[PDB]
Design a binder for this molecule. Structure first.
Ligand SMILES: *[C@@H]1O[C@H](CO)[C@@H](O[C@@H]2O[C@H](CO)[C@@H](O[C@@H]3O[C@H](CO[C@H]4O[C@H](CO)[C@@H](O)[C@H](O)[C@@H]4O)[C@@H](O)[C@H](O[C@H]4O[C@H](CO)[C@@H](O)[C@H](O)[C@@H]4O)[C@@H]3O)[C@H](O)[C@H]2NC(C)=O)[C@H](O)[C@H]1NC(C)=O
Ligand SMILES: *[C@@H]1O[C@H](CO)[C@@H](O[C@@H]2O[C@H](CO)[C@@H](O[C@@H]3O[C@H](CO[C@H]4O[C@H](CO)[C@@H](O)[C@H](O)[C@@H]4O)[C@@H](O)[C@H](O[C@H]4O[C@H](CO)[C@@H](O)[C@H](O)[C@@H]4O)[C@@H]3O)[C@H](O)[C@H]2NC(C)=O)[C@H](O)[C@H]1NC(C)=O
Ligand SMILES: *[C@@H]1O[C@H](CO)[C@@H](O[C@@H]2O[C@H](CO)[C@@H](O[C@@H]3O[C@H](CO)[C@@H](O)[C@H](O[C@H]4O[C@H](CO)[C@@H](O)[C@H](O)[C@@H]4O)[C@@H]3O)[C@H](O)[C@H]2NC(C)=O)[C@H](O)[C@H]1NC(C)=O
Ligand SMILES: *[C@@H]1O[C@H](CO)[C@@H](O[C@@H]2O[C@H](CO)[C@@H](O[C@@H]3O[C@H](CO)[C@@H](O)[C@H](O[C@H]4O[C@H](CO)[C@@H](O)[C@H](O)[C@@H]4O)[C@@H]3O)[C@H](O)[C@H]2NC(C)=O)[C@H](O)[C@H]1NC(C)=O
Ligand SMILES: *[C@@H]1O[C@H](CO)[C@@H](O[C@@H]2O[C@H](CO)[C@@H](O)[C@H](O)[C@H]2NC(C)=O)[C@H](O)[C@H]1NC(C)=O
Ligand SMILES: *[C@@H]1O[C@H](CO)[C@@H](O[C@@H]2O[C@H](CO)[C@@H](O)[C@H](O)[C@H]2NC(C)=O)[C@H](O)[C@H]1NC(C)=O
Ligand SMILES: CSc1nnc(CCCO)n1-c1cc(C)c(C)c(C)c1
Ligand SMILES: CSc1nnc(CCCO)n1-c1cc(C)c(C)c(C)c1
Ligand SMILES: *[C@@H]1O[C@H](CO)[C@@H](O)[C@H](O)[C@H]1NC(C)=O
Ligand SMILES: *[C@@H]1O[C@H](CO)[C@@H](O)[C@H](O)[C@H]1NC(C)=O
Ligand SMILES: *[C@@H]1O[C@H](CO)[C@@H](O)[C@H](O)[C@H]1NC(C)=O
Ligand SMILES: *[C@@H]1O[C@H](CO)[C@@H](O)[C@H](O)[C@H]1NC(C)=O
Ligand SMILES: *[C@@H]1O[C@H](CO)[C@@H](O)[C@H](O)[C@H]1NC(C)=O
Ligand SMILES: *[C@@H]1O[C@H](CO)[C@@H](O)[C@H](O)[C@H]1NC(C)=O
Ligand SMILES: *[C@@H]1O[C@H](CO)[C@@H](O)[C@H](O)[C@H]1NC(C)=O
Ligand SMILES: *[C@@H]1O[C@H](CO)[C@@H](O)[C@H](O)[C@H]1NC(C)=O
Lengths: 730, 743
C-alpha cells in the first residue's frame, strides 16, 4: 500500500499521504480511495491530470503545499471529480479562489492564503456548500488593505450553515447573507460598527463571533490595534433582535465598557457568552444585562482588570443571582486582594454552578468557608493567586484558553481545589480549615518546604488525588501524608530541597501505610540513597514513576543494599525507570523487579547491554521500552524468553544486526535486514544494495504490516543511492 | 615541550599542572625545575619511594582525588626523600591511616575526605613544623567510623601549629593538649554537645573558633543531621571562652541555641564576625543581653532562626542592636515575618558603618520603604524572596553562610543597590519606588512582571544605572519605555516573554536610541523574530549587545530584506553575541552591515554550514571571532588577505576536515587558533601564533603525520594544550594513544 499508506475506516478507504516530501500528486494511489490527505508536502502544481480518472474521491486535503511561490492550480482542475464534497486548501499561498470548482462541494476551506476578492463565479454556484472557511487572508502582514466581497456572493449559497471570515479586514458585516447560516465567525475583521440591518435575516443563527473588533490591544502577542482612543465596538440596540436561536456569543476583546441588556431581549437560549478582555468592572458591579440570561450556562468575564488597579475587593452585582442556569463562571484577571463571604452571596443560590474560575487574580486572602455554601461546586480554580500560609493555529479559541482547568483524572474523584502557583511556602495549621470535602487538590509550585508529619491535611482527609509537584517538601517522616488514608494518586515530581543543593537523603517508608495508593510519581527527585529502609513496600500500588533519579548510584551500592528496592511493590504493573543514568542493571536487581509488571520503561539511560534472558521472569510483561540507550545486539531466540510481549521499543540504540505486535528499531545502525503489525525502521544506515533485495521482497510479501515513514527509510550507501528511499530503487 | 603535565612559571618558581589527565602513575617525564606538582583528579593507585625519585626540589604536591571512577596505596616513607616538601595535599584518597614516615619539612598537610579514624603520634607528632593541619571529613556519618580516636597529646608536640581543622568527625569532646600556638580551630559537626571551662585552656592566641553544627537545628536539612536529645542546644559552660581574648571569628551556626550567654563575650573585645545561623534566637533577638558585649563586631549573621509555622506580623528587634557600633553587615534571612515598619529598625539607623542589610527569604508582604532613607552608609538593601506586591560537597566552602556576593558586583559598583528579585511585583505600581533613597543598582528579576513600560514607572529613582529586569513578562514596545532613566548604563532584559507563554511575540526596540549613555544591553532569550515599524536598532553609546537565543534566522531570511541593517545603527558597538540564533547562513550583505567598530563577534552554537571569510575586510578592528559549535566544512586558503587585526579565532566543534596549505600563512595577526573537536585526520605542510588547540580530532597516526610532529618540536613557543587529549583515531593499536606518544 504505497506511495501512501491505505486504510479502512467505516465504509470508506483512506490514503494518508501527509508530510512526505512529495513534489507531485502521485499516480500510485489506490483506486478504492475516497479520501486523500496530501498535506504538508512539496507539491507546486495541480492540473486536471493530477486527479485523472478518479471519480470516487470524496475528500482532498492539500493543506500546507508547498513548504520551506505558492500552489499553482489550473482552472477546472477539480471539475472532473463528480463526488468531491470536502476540499481543504489551507496555507497554499493562493492569490485567488480557484476557478471551476465542482458544485458537489459541501465543505471548502481556503484559510491562510492571499485571497482579497471574494467573487461570485469563484464560489457562487457552489450551491451545496454548508461550511465555508475564508479566515486569515487579508491579515495585517502584507498587501490587502480591505477584503473585497462582491455584493451578494453568498446570497446564492442557500444551504450555507457556517461562514468564517475571521482575521480579514472587512470594516462592515457583509450584506446579503443566506438565512441558512447557523455559525458566523467575524473575529478580528475591523468591524467597529454593527447595524440593525447587518444580521436581520439570520433567524437560524446559533453562533456569532465578533471578538477582537476594537480590541483591548494590551500585551497581546499578536498585532493589536485598537479603535481610536480606548473606544469599544459599536453595536446598535436592535442589532440582535431577530437572532432568537443564538446559543454562542463571543464579544471578547471588543473594548466594551457597557453591555446593552436589550441585545439579549430576544435571545432566550443563549448558552455561552464570552466577554474576556473588555473593561466591564463597572458592568460587573451593576449589570442590567445579567437579568436577561436565564439559560446561560457559561459566562467568561476574564481579564477585565483596570490597568494599575488592585482594589481590595471584587464588586459582584446581586443580579448574578438571576443566572439560574449557570454551570461555570470564569473570572480570571479581574485582580483584587481579598475575597469575603459576602462578595459571593449572589452565586451561592445558583443551583447548577459547578465551576468557579478565579485564576490569575493575585488574591492575598480568601474567606474559604464561603465555598461551603454551594450545593454543586465541583471545581474551585484558584491558580496564580497570592494565598499565604494560614495561621498560530487558526482553529484555536484564542480568547478562551481551552483545555480542562484541572486534570480530568484528578477532578474525576470529586470536588477539586487548585491552589497551584500561590504563596504557600509552608502549610499553615489553618490552611484547609472551613473547606468543603475536597477529593482533588493541587498545590503545585508553591515553594512549599513543609516537613510532612501526618497532620497537615487532616481537615480535608478525603483527598484522593494530590499534586505536590515543584515544591521543596520533606517526606522523611514515615507518617507523612498518612492522614489521607483514602489517597489514590500522589504526584511529588520535581521536589527538591529549598536551596537546590547537591546531597539530600530520602525515606520512603510512608508509602506502605496507604492501603489504596495506586499511582505514585517520584520523578526528578534526584533520589540516590534511602535511609534506614532500602525497600519500597506497597500492597496497593499499581504505578511507580521513578524517572530522573539515581538508580545507577542505588544499584552500584558496594553492599548491594538496594537489590530488592521495588520487589515489595507486589501489585505493580507499570514502572518508569527512564533518565536514571543506567549503564548496567545488576542481573539480580532486574530479577527483583515485581513479577506483576505489564509495562517497563528504561528509556533514555546509557544501557550498553540488556540481559534478554530475564524476561522469562516476567510472564505478564506487555511493553518494554528501551529507547535512547547504547545497546549493541539482540538475542536470536526472543520467543524462548517471553510469550507476553506485544510492544518493544528500541529506537535510538546501537543495534547493527538482526508473539508480539509492535517493533520499533528506528534510529539504529542497521545496514541491512536478513531474515506483528508495526515495524519502525527509519533512520538506519541501510546499504542500498542487492543484499537488501531480501528485505524488499519481505515487505511486498507482508502488506498488512505497517511501516511508517517509508520515505525516511533511507539508503546511506553506497554513494550511488545514498539519500534515496530504499523502496523506489530496483 | 612538557608532557604529560603542563608546566608554567608562577611568580618565582616553576609549576606543573598534571590534573585530570587520566594518569595511572606519577610521571618520570616531569620537568626538573618544577617545585609544585598538581597530580590531582587522576587514576593513580600507588605511591612508592620511586614515584618522586629525582625531584628533590619539590615543595608542594597535590595528590587529591586519586584514583577515580579501593583507594591510594602509599608505601611507608614514600615522601621521606623530599627534604623540601612543605605542602602535601592528600584529599579524597580513600586512605585508612595517616601515611607513615612523612618528612619533617611539612608546614601544611591536608588529609580531608579519607577513612582515618586514629590520629596517632607517629603519624603526625614530630612534624614539628606543621602550621596548618586539615583532618576534616574522615569519620562522617557514612560508613565505618563509629567514633574518631585521637591519641592523647598527639598535637602538644606541634608547637607551631596555627590551624587545626577536625570538622566533620565524631569527637564527642574537644581534644585535650592542644598547642598554644593555635590561631584557628575548626570543630564544626563533631558531635561535641558540651564545652567545658577547661576545653580551651591556654589557647590565648586563638582568633577563630568554629563550633557550628553541634546539636544541629536539623529541620529540612540538605545534609544528614542528628539533633541532640529533645530540641536541646549545645551546652557551653559560662567560662568556656574566658581566656580567648584574641578571638575575632566565632561560628555557632546550627547549635540549636535558644539563649546566648553574654558572659561568653566578656573577655572577647575584638570579636569581628559572629555566625548564629540556624538556631532558635527569635527571643534573644528581641531582648539580647549579649548585644551590648560586641562593640567591635562587623558582621552578624542571625539567619534562619524562624520558628516552625510562625509567620508573625512583625519582627521584634532589640534596642540593644544600637550597641553594635562597628556593624558593617547584618544578615537576617529567614526570620519570616509579614511587615517591616519604620520603628522596627530604629536601632540600626544610628550604626555609622552599616552598609549591608540582608533581609532575603523572609516572605515580607510590606515594607515601609522610607525607613531606608535614615541610613548614612547603606550600600546594599537585599530583599530577594519576599512578597512585596504592586504599590498603589566541597569541604572548603562555608557550609552555613552562603558565600558569593549578594548582588552582582558590576551592579553594586554603580552605587546603592536594591534587590527586589523574586517578590510579587506582577506590575509596577505608581508608588513602587516612592520614598526610596537614590538607587543606582536595581534588581527586579523574576517577579512575573507584565508592565507595559511607558516612561513613568521609574521616575522616583531616576538615577538607576544598572537595571536587571530578567525573567519578567514586560512589554517594551512603547518607544518611551525606561526613558525616565536617562543615566542608565546597563539593561538586562534576558528571558523576557509574554505572561501566557504564548509564542508569536512582536517587538519594538526604538526606546534604545533615547539613552545617550547606555553601554550594555542584554536581549538574550527573548525569542525575537520580528520587529514592528522600525527594523533598525540605533545607538550612539552602546558598546555591548547580547542577542543570543533569538531568531535572526527568521529576521534575516526575510523576503523583503527588511533587517539587512538591523544592527548597523549601533555605531559604537564593539561586542556582539549572536549565539543560539539557529543561523544556517548569514546573507552576505547582512553580515557587512554589522557595525564596523566590532572587536568581538560571537556566532557560536548556531548551524552555520558556510562562512564568507572575505567579509572580514569590512572589520579592521575585529580581534575575536567565535564560531564554535557550528557545521563549517573548510577554511579559506589565504586568511591574511581578509584581516590584519584578528588575534583569536575559535573553531571548536565544527566539521573542518582539511587545513588549507598556505593557511596559517602570511599575515599572522593571529595569536590563538582553536581547532579542537573538528574532523582533522592530519596536518600537512603549512607566524605570531602562540596557542593552537587541536584535541578531539580523529588523527590518522600513520606515518604522514610525522610532518606535523616535527613541526611541533620546531615551534616550542606555540602552546598546545591538552596534548594528552590530542589522540590517534587510526590505525588500531595507535587508536587512543596521544600522537606525541607515537615513535
Ligand atoms: C507523574 O506520573 C503520573 C502517572 O504517570 C502522570 O500522570 C499521568 O499522565 C499521563 C500522561 O503522561 C496520563 O495519561 C494520558 O491520559 C489521557 C486521558 O486518558 C483518557 O482515555 C483513556 C483511554 O484508555 C482512559 O484510560 C482514561 O481513563 C482517560 O479517560 C490520554 O489521552 C493519554 O493517551 C495517551 O496514549 C495514546 C496511545 O495509546 C495516545 O494516542 C495519546 O496521545 C496519549 O499519549 C494518556 O494516557 C495519565 O492519565 C496520568 N495519570 C494520572 C493518575 O494523572 C503525571 O503527569 C506525572 N507528573 C508529571 C509532572 O510529570
Ligand atoms: C546579559 O548580558 C550581560 C553582558 O554580557 C551579562 O553581564 C556580564 O556577564 C559576564 C559574565 O558572564 C561578566 O564578565 C565577567 O566579569 C567578571 C568580573 O570581572 C572582574 O575582573 C576583571 C579583571 O580583568 C575585570 O575585567 C572586570 O572589570 C571585573 O573587575 C570576570 O571575572 C569574568 O572573567 C572571565 O574571563 C576570564 C578569562 O580571561 C576567566 O578567567 C573568568 O573566569 C571569566 O571567564 C567575566 O569577564 C560581565 O562582567 C558582565 N557585565 C555586566 C555589565 O554586568 C549578564 O550576565 C547577562 N544576563 C544574563 C541573565 O545572562
Ligand atoms: C469565540 O467564541 C466561540 C464560542 O462562543 C468560539 O467558537 C469555537 O471556535 C473553536 C475554534 O475555531 C471551534 O473549535 C473547533 O471545532 C471544530 C468543529 O468540530 C473542530 O474542527 C476543531 O477540533 C480540531 O482541531 C483542534 C485544534 O486545532 C484539535 O485539537 C481537535 O482534535 C480537532 O482536530 C475545534 O474543536 C469551536 O467549534 C467553536 N465553537 C462552536 C462552533 O460552538 C470562537 O473560536 C471564539 N473566537 C475566538 C477568536 O477565539
Ligand atoms: C564558620 O565560620 C567561619 C568564619 O567564622 C568559617 O571559616 C571560613 O571557612 C572558609 C571555608 O574553608 C574559608 O574560606 C577559604 O579560605 C581559604 C584560605 O584563605 C581558601 O583556601 C578558600 O578558597 C579556596 O576555595 C574557594 C572555593 O572552595 C576558591 O574560591 C579558591 O580558589 C580556593 O581554592 C576559601 O576562601 C575561610 O578561610 C574561613 N574563615 C577564616 C579562616 O577566617 C567556617 O567555614 C564556618 N564553618 C562552616 C562549617 O561553615
Ligand atoms: C497543577 O498545577 C499545574 C500548574 O497549573 C499544572 O501543570 C500544567 O500541566 C499541564 C497539563 O498537563 C501542562 O501542559 C503544563 O505544562 C503545566 N503547567 C505548568 C504551569 O507547569 C498541573 O497539571 C496541575 N495538576 C492538576 C492535577 O490539575
Ligand atoms: C537578580 O536576582 C537574581 C535572582 O536572585 C540573580 O540571579 C542569580 O544570578 C547568579 C549570578 O549571575 C546565579 O549564580 C544564580 O543562579 C541566579 N539565580 C537565579 C534564580 O536565577 C541575579 O544575579 C540578580 N542580579 C544582579 C545584578 O545581581
Ligand atoms: C492586575 S492589574 C494590572 N495593571 N497593570 C497590569 C499589567 C500592565 C498592563 O497590562 N496588570 C496586570 C494584569 C494582568 C491580567 C496580569 C496577568 C498581570 C501580570 C498584571
Ligand atoms: C518561616 S516559617 C516555616 N515554618 N515551617 C517552614 C518549613 C519547614 C522547615 O523545615 N517554614 C519555612 C521556613 C523557611 C526558612 C522557608 C524558606 C520556608 C519555605 C518555610
Ligand atoms: C433553518 O433551519 C431549519 C431546520 O430547523 C430548516 O428547515 C430551514 O430550511 C432553515 N432555514 C433556511 C435554509 O433558510
Ligand atoms: C441543572 O442541571 C440539570 C441536569 O443537567 C437540568 O435538568 C436542570 O434543568 C438544570 N437547572 C437549570 C436551572 O437549568
Ligand atoms: C491491584 O491493583 C488493582 C487496581 O489496579 C486493585 O483492584 C487491587 O486491589 C490490587 N490487587 C492486590 C492483590 O493488591
Ligand atoms: C543473565 O544473567 C543470569 C544471572 O541471573 C546469567 O545466568 C546469564 O548468564 C546472563 N545472560 C547473559 C547473556 O549475560
Ligand atoms: C602567639 O602569637 C604571637 C603572634 O601573634 C607570637 O608572638 C607568640 O609567640 C605566639 N605564641 C606561640 C607561638 O606560642
Ligand atoms: C567605620 O569604617 C572606617 C573605615 O573603614 C573605620 O576607620 C571606622 O573605625 C569605622 N567605624 C567604627 C565605629 O568602627
Ligand atoms: C564608544 O565606547 C568606547 C568604549 O568602548 C569609548 O572609548 C568611546 O569613547 C565611545 N564612543 C562614543 C561615540 O560614545
Ligand atoms: C563573499 O561575498 C562577497 C560579496 O562581497 C563575494 O564577492 C564573494 O564571492 C563571496 N565569497 C564566497 C566564498 O561566497
Amino acid at each position: 500500500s504505497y506511495p501512501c499508506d491505505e486504510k479502512k475506516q467505516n465504509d470508506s478507504v483512506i490514503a494518508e499521504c501527509s508530510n512526505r516530501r512529495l513534489q507531485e500528486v502521485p499516480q500510485t494511489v489506490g483506486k478504492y480511495v475516497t479520501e486523500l490527505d496530501l498535506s504538508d508536502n512539496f507539491i507546486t502544481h495541480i492540473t486536471n491530470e493530477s486527479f485523472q480518472g478518479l471519480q470516487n474521491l470524496t475528500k482532498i486535503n492539500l493543506n500546507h503545499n508547498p513548504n520551506v511561490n505558492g500552489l499553482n492550480i489550473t482552472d477546472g482542475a477539480f471539475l472532473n471529480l463528480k463526488n468531491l464534497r470536502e476540499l481543504l486548501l489551507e496555507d497554499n499561498q493562493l492569490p485567488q479562489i480557484p476557478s471551476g470548482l465542482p458544485e458537489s462541494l459541501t465543505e471548502l476551506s481556503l484559510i491562510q492564503n492571499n485571497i482579497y476578492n471574494i467573487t461570485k463565479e469563484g464560489i457562487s454556484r457552489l450551491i451545496n456548500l454548508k461550511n465555508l472557511y475564508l479566515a486569515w487572508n487579508c491579515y495585517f502582514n502584507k498587501v490587502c488593505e480591505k477584503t473585497n466581497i462582491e455584493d451578494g456572493v453568498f446570497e446564492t449559497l442557500t444551504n450555507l450553515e457556517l461562514l468564517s471570515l475571521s482575521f480579514n479586514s472587512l470594516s462592515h458585516v457583509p450584506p446579503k447573507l443566506p438565512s441558512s447560516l447557523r455559525k458566523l465567525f467575524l473575529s478580528n475583521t475591523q468591524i467597529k460598527y454593527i447595524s440593525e440591518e447587518d444580521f436581520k435575516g439570520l433567524i437560524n443563527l446559533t453562533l456569532l463571533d465578533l471578538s477582537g473588533n476594537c480590541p483591548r490591544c494590551f500585551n497581546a502577542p499578536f498585532p493589536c490595534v485598537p479603535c481610536d482612543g480606548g473606544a469599544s465596538i459599536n453595536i446598535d440596540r436592535f442589532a440582535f433582535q431577530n437572532l432568537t436561536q443564538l446559543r454562542y456569543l463571543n464579544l471578547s476583546s471588543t473594548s466594551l465598557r457597557k453591555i446593552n441588556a436589550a441585545w439579549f431581549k430576544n435571545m432566550p437560549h443563549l448558552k455561552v457568552l464570552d466577554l474576556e478582555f473588555n473593561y466591564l468592572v463597572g458592568e460587573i458591579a451593576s449589570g442590567a444585562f445579567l437579568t436577561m440570561l436565564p439559560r446561560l450556562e457559561i459566562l467568561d468575564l476574564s481579564f477585565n482588570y483596570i490597568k494599575g488597579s488592585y482594589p481590595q475587593h471584587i464588586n459582584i452585582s446581586r443580579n448574578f443571582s438571576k443566572l439560574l442556569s449557570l454551570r461555570a463562571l470564569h473570572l480570571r484577571g479581574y485582580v483584587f486582594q481579598e475575597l469575603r463571604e459576602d462578595d459571593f452571596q449572589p452565586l451561592m443560590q445558583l443551583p447548577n454552578l459547578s465551576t468557579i474560575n478565579l485564576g490569575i487574580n493575585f488574591i492575598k486572602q480568601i474567606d474559604f468557608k464561603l465555598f461551603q455554601n454551594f450545593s454543586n461546586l465541583e471545581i474551585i480554580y484558584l491558580s496564580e493567586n497570592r494565598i499565604s500560609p494560614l495561621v498560530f493555529d487558526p482553529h484555536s479559541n484564542f480568547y478562551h484558553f481551552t483545555r480542562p482547568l484541572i486534570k480530568p483524572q484528578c477532578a474525576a474523584y470529586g470536588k477539586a481545589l487548585d491552589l497551584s502557583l500561590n504563596s504557600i511556602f509552608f502549610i499553615g495549621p489553618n490552611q484547609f480549615e472551613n473547606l468543603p470535602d475536597i477529593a482533588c487538590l493541587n498545590l503545585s509550585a508553591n515553594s512549599n518546604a513543609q516537613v510532612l508529619s501526618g497532620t497537615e491535611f487532616s481537615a480535608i482527609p478525603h483527598v484522593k488525588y494530590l499534586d505536590l509537584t515543584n515544591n521543596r517538601l520533606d517526606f522523611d517522616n514515615a507518617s507523612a501524608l498518612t492522614e489521607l488514608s483514602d489517597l489514590e494518586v500522589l504526584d511529588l515530581s520535581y521536589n527538591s530541597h529549598y536551596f537546590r543543593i547537591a546531597g539530600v537523603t530520602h525515606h520512603l517508608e510512608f508509602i506502605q501505610n496507604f492501603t489504596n495508593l495506586k499511582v505514585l510519581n517520584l520523578s526528578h527527585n534526584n533520589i540516590y540513597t534511602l535511609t534506614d529502609k532500602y525497600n519500597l513496600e506497597s500492597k496497593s500500588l499499581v504505578e511507580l514513576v521513578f524517572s530522573g533519579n539515581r538508580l545507577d548510584i542505588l544499584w552500584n551500592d558496594d553492599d548491594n543494599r538496594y537489590i530488592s528496592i521495588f520487589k515489595g511493590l507486589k501489585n505493580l504493573t507499570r514502572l518508569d525507570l527512564s533518565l536514571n543514568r543506567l549503564k548496567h542493571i545488576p542481573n539480580e536487581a532486574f530479577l527483583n523487579l515485581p513479577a506483576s509488571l505489564t509495562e517497563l520503561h528504561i528509556n533514555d539511560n546509557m544501557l550498553k547491554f540488556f540481559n534478554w534472558t530475564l524476561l522469562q521472569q516476567f510472564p505478564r510483561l506487555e511493553l518494554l521500552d528501551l529507547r535512547g540507550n547504547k545497546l549493541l545486539f539482540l538475542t536470536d531466540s526472543l520467543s524462548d524468553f517471553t510469550s507476553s510481549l506485544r510492544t518493544l521499543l528500541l529506537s535510538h540504540n546501537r543495534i547493527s544486526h538482526l508473539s508480539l505486535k509492535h517493533l520499533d528499531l528506528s534510529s539504529n545502525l542497521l545496514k541491512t535486514i536478513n531474515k506483528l503489525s508495526m515495524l519502525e525502521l527509519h533512520g538506519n544506515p541501510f546499504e542500498c544494495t542487492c543484499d537488501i533485495g531480501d528485505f524488499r521482497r519481505w515487505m511486498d510479501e507482508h502488506l498488512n504490516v505497517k511501516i511508517p515513514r517509508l520515505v525516511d527509510v533511507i539508503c546511506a550507501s553506497p554513494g550511488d543511492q545514498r539519500g534515496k528511499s530504499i523502496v523506489s530503487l530496483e
